[PDB]
Amino acid sequence: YFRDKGKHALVVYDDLSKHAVAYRQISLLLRRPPGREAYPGDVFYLHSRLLERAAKLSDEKGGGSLTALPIIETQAGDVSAYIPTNVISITDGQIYLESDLFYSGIRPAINVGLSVSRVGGAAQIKA
Amino acid sequence: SLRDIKTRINATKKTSQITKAMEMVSTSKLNRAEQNAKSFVPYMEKIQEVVANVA
């Protein structure tokens, strides 16, 4: 609504991992055939149909914007899992948090040598 | 976790590479140093003989 009227908006999804689990529950109880890590084949289309709605419009459309910050939880550091690799491929960048840095006293706990944004440079100011 | 074992393998492999590199350069240094120490024996013996027999 704010984007369609020329204003800016930010949307946070506290955990997409619990949202995928909620869909797995409904799909298995409805008897749709399972795939990888017991999830339905439909699960990539679930998050991509959601996250592609965040965009910056053209001046003819009004110049409005919507940015997204989805969150995912990894089991024991497994970034190679189904839902994590699926959402890592959809986003324009990822911030990686380490359980190791967090107890070592690097408090925000961000892995700067692994985290990436494609828009880097274009997003920042000249200074 | 498999990731903890795998990252520990990469780190230990880097240490193995590091230790082997230093062992071979030290082996090369020893082969020369052992010969060098032995090469000065006749000078060390001749100087000890002249200073002792003169004193």
Automatic annotation (TrEMBL), chain B:
Belongs to the ATPase gamma chain family. F-type ATPases have 2 components, CF(1) - the catalytic core - and CF(0) - the membrane proton channel. CF(1) has five subunits: alpha(3), beta(3), gamma(1), delta(1), epsilon(1). CF(0) has three main subunits: a, b and c. It is found in: Cell membrane. The chain holds residues 3 to 57 of 285 of the full protein. It comes from the Bacteria. It comes from Bacillus sp. (strain PS3). This is ATP synthase gamma chain. Produces ATP from ADP in the presence of a proton gradient across the membrane. The gamma chain is believed to be important in regulating ATPase activity and the flow of protons through the CF(0) complex. The gene is uncG.
